[PDB]
Chains A and B, each alone.
With several copies, the nearest count.
Chain A
Amino acid sequence: EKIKPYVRSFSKALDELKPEIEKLTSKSLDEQLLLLSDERAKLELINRYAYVLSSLMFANMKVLGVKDMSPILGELKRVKSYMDKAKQYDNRITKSNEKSQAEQEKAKNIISN
């Protein structure tokens, strides 16, 4: 009367997930990085698979319901950590384009000046 709704609502999540998995796990992880020459996009592709695997092993431990959730949780903070490095690097790159455009637009004003 209470768990009988959630079991459908839990299993419908994975059935909505598993054909996305078989497409995502279709090409091997070393193969798909070999398609992308972008090393910056490689850092997104690698950590995404670890974030998914950390998501379900935590959730399988939530299905197992062991009261000891400590070792599964700290590696998630590493998984939390290695996405933080990515964005701060990119903001340097994007604002580096903001810097070189600041001169070329200013210098060609001086050519008019």
Chain B
Amino acid sequence: TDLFDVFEETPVELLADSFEQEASREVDASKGLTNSETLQVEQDGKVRLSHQVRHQVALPPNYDYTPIAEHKRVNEARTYPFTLDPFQDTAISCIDRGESVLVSAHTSAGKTVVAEYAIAQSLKNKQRVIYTSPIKALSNQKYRELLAEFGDVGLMTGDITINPDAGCLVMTTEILRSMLYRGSEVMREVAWVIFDEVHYMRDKERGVVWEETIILLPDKVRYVFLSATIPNAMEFAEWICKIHSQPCHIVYTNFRPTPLQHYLFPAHGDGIYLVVDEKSTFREENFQKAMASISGDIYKIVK
């Protein structure tokens, strides 16, 4: 029979170092594509362009902090004859002092200058350093870009692994995270790792890895992060500093190295108008003329 009809049946019922920093420059006046000058010239013959720099550090608990804007680098592990724009001076000083660091800047802003200070520093500490680049093609790029710079640089890839016994190693995150799970001996000689393209952690497929690897990476190692100009970067610094218990600096800038000109091209039209200048000021009325143009075109553009 059924025992389970007894349940169907009826009852018988009756934060630190946060500041905005100013820096500027001057650029020659030019027409670009429009018929006159894009911006007002200076009286000297330039056009002056200014930009903003932000820094903030995530403090560890029980950590007595000295400001890095008070710091002086007595000797460089890596030389630079040019003018150190103080978003670069702020962060290399942090790497000079021995701290984890985020760089949130443009691709041409100068993230190459800063992170390479950590490479020769381990070489000036007789230690091994690791560069993590996301793409094989970048890995072969950053191998060639750094092996010609120091020579003690190696490659590990899924495709081709050359010189695992080098002092520096251009390699991937997925090389690195697997060697954490493999428990690799190279992880012993590390005090510094560069993270290229840190804003790739937003990937729906691979963005798990840039998070999961960092928590698997030790609290000893001070880190180097190259990320894009991003708005929510300081909450990420909370995520760094909590889990490693070491200070994490961020470097934000809006610095645009080459001056850009934004033109709108109508299909099967000719009127090609500056709508956003070098100074990011939207030309509303040129845009009005761009839309009022509306009632193989590449050959018009190229020649």
A-side residues, CB < 8 A to B, are 2, 58, 73, 76, 80
Contact = CB atoms under 8 A, between A and B. Distances in A.
Top-3 shortest CB links A-B: A80-B4, A76-B7, A2-B14
Nearest to A73: B7
Contacts, number: 6
Interface of B: 4, 7, 14
B14 A58 contact: no
Contacts of B14: 2
Q: Would you call the interface of chain A mostly helix, strand, loop, or mixed? A: helix
A64 to B, nearest CB: 15
6 contacts: A2-B14, A58-B7, A73-B7, A76-B4, A76-B7, A80-B4
Nearest to B7: A76
Contacts of A76: 4, 7
Nearest to B11: A62
Contacts of B4: 76, 80
Contacts of B7: 58, 73, 76
Nearest to A80: B4
Contacts of A73: 7
